[PDB]
Curated annotation (Swiss-Prot), chains A, B:
Pathway: Carbohydrate biosynthesis; 3-deoxy-D-manno-octulosonate biosynthesis; 3-deoxy-D-manno-octulosonate from D-ribulose 5-phosphate: step 2/3; Bacterial outer membrane biogenesis; lipopolysaccharide biosynthesis
InterPro entries, per database record: Aldolase_TIM (IPR013785), DAHP1/KDSA (IPR006218), KDO8P_synthase (IPR006269)
Biological process per Gene Ontology, one example term: keto-3-deoxy-D-manno-octulosonic acid biosynthetic process
Protein name, per record: 2-dehydro-3-deoxyphosphooctonate aldolase
EC number annotated for this UniProt entry: 2.5.1.55
Compartmental location: Cytoplasm
UniProt entry keywords in alphabetical sequence: Cytoplasm, Lipopolysaccharide biosynthesis, Transferase
UniProt main location, coarse: cytoplasm
PANTHER family given in the database record: PHOSPHO-2-DEHYDRO-3-DEOXYHEPTONATE ALDOLASE
Keyword Cytoplasm annotated: yes
Protein family: Belongs to the KdsA family.
Family matches, as SUPFAM superfamilies: Aldolase (SSF51569)
Catalytic activity reported: D-arabinose 5-phosphate + phosphoenolpyruvate + H2O = 3-deoxy-alpha-D-manno-2-octulosonate-8-phosphate + phosphate
Amino acid sequence: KSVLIAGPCVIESLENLRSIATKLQPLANNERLDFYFKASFDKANRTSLESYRGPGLEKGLEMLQTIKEEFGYKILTDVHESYQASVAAKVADILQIPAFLCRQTDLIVEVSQTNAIVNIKKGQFMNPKDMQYSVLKALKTRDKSIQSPTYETALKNGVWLCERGSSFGYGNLVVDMRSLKIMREFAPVIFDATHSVQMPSFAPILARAAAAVGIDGLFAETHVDPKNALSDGANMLKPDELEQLVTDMLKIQNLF
Amino acid sequence: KSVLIAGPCVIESLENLRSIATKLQPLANNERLDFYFKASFDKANRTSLESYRGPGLEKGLEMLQTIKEEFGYKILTDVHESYQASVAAKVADILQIPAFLCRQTDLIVEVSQTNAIVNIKKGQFMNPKDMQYSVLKALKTRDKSIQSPTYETALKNGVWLCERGSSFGYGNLVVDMRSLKIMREFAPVIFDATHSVQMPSFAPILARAAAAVGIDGLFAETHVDPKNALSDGANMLKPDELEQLVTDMLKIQNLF
Ligand SMILES: [Zn+2]
């Protein structure tokens, strides 16, 4: 099944998490999807000291665990520091390595020592071919015999790569669709349709393009009321918009 | 005085640190320079699990302290996690925020709570205008009354910005010299002549350009025998090469 990772950018409140979890129930039950509910417990890189951070590790994981129990959802969250991985893996089925930390050896190893699927975001600064080395760090942590990263070995060992765009001058990200093909030599590839759009509405067009190229899954942030969101309101889809997008992805994938 | 930050990329051994420290003694006594000896205790983002990492925090700081004591040098090192800052500041006169972590709030705040000068490396993915927000996080930590970052206030409070190039397609960094002017509105500006050169030596040429534009200091890594170095051998200058470069920088700066 194609992977769908969806949810709000940040944990805002348990009430908010519940509302979005509720509106994702139709997609979560879609037989053609392997679904994971996403929410960050920490936004580590915001513009100001006053910017909303999220609830942090302990309280965030507690809230994600509540969603897992109440909705039966598998969970994705991102980690930022040493010693978060093992604690987060008790709740999270996928642990995500942030794009800025995508080469960070200790974090990749620490996450790979857990039982979680590892989703490695490609840095905006990276050549897709060089992501093989991050995949290999993870794979060697799980099986020291592995010498070279391949899709099949990565799929078996739960290590994925995630496309989220590349720096294109200042304040602009471009999605090099060739990267989806290049990276898929080394690991299953997820396309992040939310964070990849920056320009100095394009989420569906890029996700359709990505589906046509060949991807193993979609990452897209969604919120019931984006204009009242505490992070990424301008770029999140409403649940009905996401359903439409997923419908199109599936139709495209059904051709090939 | 113009700042000079120089030393090996990584701490290789005490013997190596002493050898390069010895060769830097003439530069360190140049009264036109405010000199800091640099060496990383950890290389966090290397290609493979087997790549040389460095001695780690505890042993690294011991070695840097020995250099400070034996040579009288002020010290710069980079920190990678918040919990390292308070102990690192006991030895390092400057704590450097790595380029990939240049927006990381907790790290900037923790480092800024120490008495160290803060050297914030501009990420390869950043618009130089946006570096004001990282400077402001640091400044507000040191003086809550500050509303917007300026060169004067950053200088007073020991917060600097460091140019190290920008992503230019794949496997290429370009130095946008306009950035030196733009960032200097917000803080003193150091130019990193070592890590800014990547192409699919240009260090002296880019350093001369930077000197002509207007900078508060130079960061350049140097090693006695680069071909036998454990990190960044290809990009480090021999001490005599660094001396020539600094001589040229000072001649240019004396014109204006
Ligand atoms: Zn987001």
